[PDB]
Design a protein around this ligand. Structure first.
Ligand code: HEM
Ligand code: HEM
Ligand SMILES: N=C(Nc1cccc(CCNCc2cccc(NC(=N)c3cncs3)c2)c1)c1cncs1
Ligand SMILES: N=C(Nc1cccc(CCNCc2cccc(NC(=N)c3cncs3)c2)c1)c1cncs1
Ligand SMILES: C[C@H](O)[C@H](O)[C@H]1CNc2nc(N)[nH]c(=O)c2N1
Ligand SMILES: C[C@H](O)[C@H](O)[C@H]1CNc2nc(N)[nH]c(=O)c2N1
Ligand SMILES: [Ca+2]
Ligand SMILES: [Cl-]
Ligand SMILES: [Cl-]
Ligand SMILES: [Gd]
Ligand SMILES: [Gd]
Ligand SMILES: [Gd]
Ligand SMILES: [Zn+2]
Lengths: 403, 403
């Protein structure tokens, strides 16, 4: 049981939950690979995962060992013997989606894990129905700016049949267009998906913030292009409370972070299409998406407008510009009445989550490099908190791109 | 071998050097403990470490497999067989100290590793002579503000005789006077050594920046107290280039960071007293030493003086105040003509070091959580660089406090 110290307060806890970690991570006693973005590259197998998930479920409602518990176990055995897979009950699906969020080591927003609206799309057939489910998800989750966490679960992977897939990494993304000079207009992160939408009959734009169409794939068909109704896509124009020229930069971002390319795993079952959404932490937009060198990379543009000395690093012009961009993001979302959390509030709430999970489960899997914000790291309490990283199931996992 | 990606550029390398890591870290496939501050707490074993070190030395001078190489291996074998231990050649000590710096995974300053002045104090016989060696180190390293990297190596551990130890964690440290109510005047990081200095006869001050005396331990001797000559301790008063009231805070810091409590290990030999010094990166002073809540904790006082709204996190008052404190540190050291490096220049130079080391050795041990600076993390290139952490020897290691 690893001993874990908070260096600000000097308090000590022991992570006993890490002993339950099912899958193996990339580290060994010889070398630590904790900084890697990607840590990883039949009925007998499925059953053991399914059994252990059912046990988790009945334990969490204080009915482990019950007659209902035995009945459910024998149902999944007969299902898998007949069909090669099995079906989750509605409450098991809800429990599993929430646990997968709860177990996500890189998520700083997990204080909210018990509040998640689960939309059951497992009856879906055809991309046209997918689009309708997705549109209802966006409508519900946006809620005129009063954002609400939600997940929509499309049919599970099964033998001899293709997957439902959302090709887009998020439900809302901005196009990125290349030119002869190899540069990108728009989001460089989305160049690949932008040319895929083009290579499927989308008329591109010429803007820095053109909302991409969706490429939805029903099993064993090619993907189909769908355009999001523009009144479903809430956007926030960015302005600054005191720097009046900031608005003239024409920056904007979208309200709803809706991740659509991860795989949800519950009880050995795999849902390759299960988009989930919550709300943004301000540094995601103001520091990463707008200031990363391989994203919009606007930091020097802002610093020039601020009349800062960009010819020496020791003026900290980068740090001053970054703070004002994050201010503009917070100010703009609050003025537009769109839910947003700043990095100080979010890390404080994660510390409370760590304390709750110590009491509830004996620990909490956490990835320090992703929990600590990308600006002002040591000014937040999570910086001073030792963390144990490990993989529990149910889980959200990376998966190969469809193409 | 681990594949390692730079996400800013997209470039990929393989860390083949990690396969040579001898001593084991705390991670397993089950759980990663990379964020823990303390990862770690016989003639045949000595010979294999010595042999490996001698091989490194003769490779470094392009004389591997030479007669001199084979004769030195046999010479070390003979000495170990006769005495249970052996002595380094002067050239080996210089090389080994530079290698231990080169191997230190938490050091962002390793672009400099080949420029190190090595003072051989292995003939030291008393705490008084230890003090003379230390004063000459400080004088050389400080160089009237044009700081020069240096290490002084005191005699190695040997059986039947106690260790040389410097009890202080650095050669220059400010007193921390612990109060009644758990408050502290001065540096809370130094409460323990301050109380030990008083218990050994030091007459304490009552200021916030009182330089501590040295507690120097000769073999099998109680520690002995030595006061540093004031003219040897260069200090920098802190002012801000445009906030004139900042100088009235009365803050100062010292020029020379000189770590004195780590153990230096070379070829299986152990040097428990081997203080080393370089120069500061400005975030160590401006962000950690002055803004950590458990150190000088000046953030709120500065923010209030700046007229920031400290009642709401989303004003980013903490971020704005921390930037100006870091500006003051850099401005003050530059004005005093004392060497200092900002975190943008340091991390840029560390990226150059990684490229050099990939070519030279096929990898570089690096601790991402310590390499990324405590403010403005993703504004520096190291944030976007995957890193592999592992332990090579020669090495600097933590060791228990001698009291
Ligand atoms: C409610 C507000 C939420 C906030 C403020 C939040 C915040 C964050 C942040 C800042 C990250 C790091 C992502 C990055 O840097 O790319 C993250 C990761 C993650 N979040 Fe949350 N999140 C929220 C809700 C949710 C929900 C509702 C789910 C799923 C039900 C979820 C699942 C995940 C997962 C799986 C990751 C890891 C993603 C990866 O490894 O790339 N989060 N979250
Ligand atoms: C020349 C300028 C140098 C700079 C700017 C520099 C910078 C740094 C910084 C910022 C850290 C992190 C320290 C912390 O956050 O507590 C560090 C760690 C370290 N440095 Fe360097 N350093 C320099 C020279 C040296 C030298 C000369 C040596 C030894 C010969 C050295 C050995 C180490 C070691 C062993 C660590 C790890 C300490 C630990 O694990 O607690 N550095 N350095
Ligand atoms: N682009 C690449 N990099 C890449 C690879 C893996 C991961 C990532 C990071 C993208 N995380 C998006 C994300 C995930 C989870 C949370 C958030 N934030 C939020 N607040 C929420 C999103 N939903 C509800 S809350 C944002 C980037 C590629 C690599 N290989 C081909 S593409
Ligand atoms: N309180 C504790 N703190 C604590 C524990 C472990 C580590 C640390 C960090 C100390 N790093 C000081 C340090 C080391 C190396 C480099 C630098 N910087 C520099 N630029 C230089 C110093 N020389 C040349 S360059 C600064 C602090 C305790 C631990 N266990 C019981 S208490
Ligand atoms: C190389 C490194 O692991 C990578 O850049 C990580 C670091 N920490 C992160 N932290 C968050 N929240 N999001 C990220 O994308 C990353 N990227
Ligand atoms: C818990 C965590 O490991 C600890 O606070 C570390 C994080 N990264 C650090 N990085 C540096 N350079 N110095 C530090 O003291 C720390 N502290
Ligand atoms: Ca000899
Ligand atoms: Cl995003
Ligand atoms: Cl220090
Ligand atoms: Gd061209
Ligand atoms: Gd102007
Ligand atoms: Gd002024
Ligand atoms: Zn690890």
């Amino acid at each position: 049981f690893p001993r874990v110290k908070n260096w600000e307060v000097g308090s000590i806890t022991y992570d006993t939950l890490s002993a339950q970690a099912q899958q193996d991570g990339p580290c060994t006693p010889r070398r630590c690979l904790g900084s890697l973005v990607f840590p990883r590259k039949a009925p007998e197998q499925l059953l053991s995962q399914a059994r252990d998930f059912i046990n988790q479920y009945y334990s969490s409602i204080k009915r482990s060992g019950s007659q209902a518990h035995e009945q459910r176990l024998q149902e999944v055995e007969a299902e898998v013997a007949a069909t090669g897979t099995y079906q989750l009950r509605e409450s098991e699906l809800v429990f599993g989606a929430k646990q997968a969020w709860r177990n996500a080591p890189r998520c700083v927003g997990r204080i909210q894990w018990g509040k998640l609206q689960v939309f059951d799309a497992r009856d879906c057939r055809s991309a046209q129905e997918m689009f309708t489910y997705i549109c209802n998800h966006i409508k519900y989750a946006t809620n005129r700016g009063n954002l609400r966490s939600a997940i929509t679960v499309f049919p599970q992977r099964c033998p001899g049949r293709g997957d439902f897939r959302i090709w887009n990494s998020q439900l809302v993304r901005y196009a990125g267009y290349r030119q002869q000079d190899g540069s990108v207009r728009g989001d460089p992160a989305n160049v690949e998906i932008t040319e895929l939408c083009i290579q499927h009959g989308w008329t591109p734009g010429n803007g820095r913030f053109d909302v991409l169409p969706l490429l939805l794939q029903a099993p064993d068909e090619p993907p189909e292009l769908f355009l999001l109704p523009p009144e479903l896509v809430l956007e926030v124009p960015l302005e600054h409370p005191t720097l009046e020229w900031f608005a003239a930069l024409g920056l904007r971002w979208y309200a709803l972070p809706a991740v659509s390319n991860m795989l949800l795993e519950i009880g050995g079952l795999e849902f390759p299409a299960a988009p989930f959404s919550g709300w943004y932490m301000s540094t995601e937009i103001g520091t990463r998406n707008l200031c990363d060198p391989h994203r919009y990379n606007i930091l020097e543009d802002v610093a020039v407008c601020m009349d800062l000395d960009t010819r020496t690093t020791s003026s900290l012009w980068k740090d001053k510009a970054a703070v004002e961009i994050n201010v503009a993001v917070l100010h703009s979302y609050q003025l537009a009445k769109v839910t947003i959390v700043d990095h100080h509030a979010a890390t404080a709430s994660f510390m409370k989550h760590l304390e709750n999970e110590q009491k509830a489960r004996g620990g909490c899997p956490a990835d320090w490099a992703w929990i600590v914000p990308p600006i002002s790291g040591s000014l937040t309490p999570v910086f001073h908190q030792e963390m144990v990283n490990y993989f529990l199931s149910p889980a959200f996992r990376y998966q190969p791109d469809p193409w």
